[PDB]
């Protein structure tokens, strides 16, 4: 029926929007001061991009971003939200005496109708590793409502990849799977499932933070320009990399983080989730290799990270890497939709 339903299994969508119907999940995001404070600073410090403008807010949740656009002087703000949080947003618009300026439109941005084109789109479509949730496509889809002059906040997104060494994280996977490597668990030999348990753990991206000293090479960057990208550009994301190793050791996988930039008429404001910056609710993401690769300082670690969109609002991750000087190769296949939250 719609672009959204064509690319999303019903069961995935139901669970997805039920999650966002809880005030506790809005609170979890809103209390991220880096996240909320930067969006406010990006909007208020570019007030001329909002003064007397028409605004579209894609996935407004409780409406916080629409209220910042109002604080910046917007004339009309259309706040679109598909979860039941839309009804709560309507309450806050009324209780804040902004019903003349903010219009909450319940539904998916791919399915609702707007009465007019807008001057700027604001949204927080970033999932962990940037691409999870496949909400960037809804952000890009919304450009059908954008005037030829239009701007977008965020304007661009950078995902960064870098190799890391973390022996303890790697070995932890086998410590957990070796539960199954015993010949008489209450009289039952479980060992035949040990290999399957290992594969299951390695398919999980690891969501948590880490010390930057585990990074073994300068990061590679892949940039999405939201003013120019099309929805189809995010179905197959190929990120070639060729790391020039700064340290010698075993490479256990690739670490991921992202930044977004609000490129306004007055200034550009950056929201970064890098491990060099204060922690956010996005943390960082690490994908292990099935087998570690030894690389000396000065060697090159080259390969590809391929992200293939699936109908569960996420991506299948294929990572291939080899040390050029030695030819030793490794790979992994990961399910971005089911990460392991390891932060404690």
């Amino acid at each position: 029926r719609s672009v959204f339903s064509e690319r999303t299994e019903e069961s995935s969508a139901v669970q997805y929007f039920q999650f966002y119907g809880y005030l506790s999940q809005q609170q979890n995001m809103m209390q991220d001061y880096v996240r909320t404070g930067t969006y406010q600073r990006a909007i208020l410090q570019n007030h001329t991009d909002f003064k007397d403008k028409i605004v579209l807010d894609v996935g407004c949740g409780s409406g916080i971003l629409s209220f910042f656009a109002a604080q910046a002087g917007a004339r009309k703000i259309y706040a679109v939200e598909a979860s039941t949080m839309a009804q709560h947003a309507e309450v806050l618009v009324k209780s804040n005496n902004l019903t003349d300026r903010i219009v909450v439109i319940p539904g998916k941005v791919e399915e609702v109708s707007l009465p007019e084109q807008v001057d700027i789109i604001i949204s927080e479509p970033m999932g962990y590793m940037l691409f999870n949730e496949r909400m960037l496509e809804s952000y890009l889809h919304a450009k059908k409502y954008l005037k030829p002059s239009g701007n977008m906040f965020p304007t661009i997104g950078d995902v960064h990849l870098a190799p890391f060494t973390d022996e303890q994280l790697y070995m932890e996977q086998f410590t957990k799977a070796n539960f199954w490597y015993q010949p008489s668990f209450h009289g039952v030999d479980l060992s035949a499932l040990r290999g399957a348990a290992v594969d299951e753990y390695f398919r999980q991206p690891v969501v948590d933070t880490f010390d930057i000293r585990i990074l073994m090479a300068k990061s590679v960057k892949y940039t999405v320009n939201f003013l120019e990208a099309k929805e189809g550009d995010l179905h197959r994301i190929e990120i070639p990399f060729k790391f020039h190793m700064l340290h010698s050791g075993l490479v256990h996988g690739l670490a991921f983080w992202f930044d977004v930039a609000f490129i306004g008429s007055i200034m550009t404001v950056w929201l970064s989730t890098a491990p060099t910056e204060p922690l956010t609710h996005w943390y960082q993401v690490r994908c292990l290799f099935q087998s570690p690769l030894f690389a000396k300082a000065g060697d090159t670690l080259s390969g590809t990270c391929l992200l293939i969109a699936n109908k569960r609002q996420s991506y299948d991750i294929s990572i291939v890497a080899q040390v050029d000087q030695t030819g030793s190769k490794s790979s992994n296949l990961l399910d971005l939709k089911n990460p392991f939250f390891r932060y404690t």
Partner: peptide, 8 residues
């Protein structure tokens, strides 16, 4: 699983 990780 949770789209947005728990955060304090």
């Amino acid at each position: 699983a949770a789209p947005r990780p728990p955060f304090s």
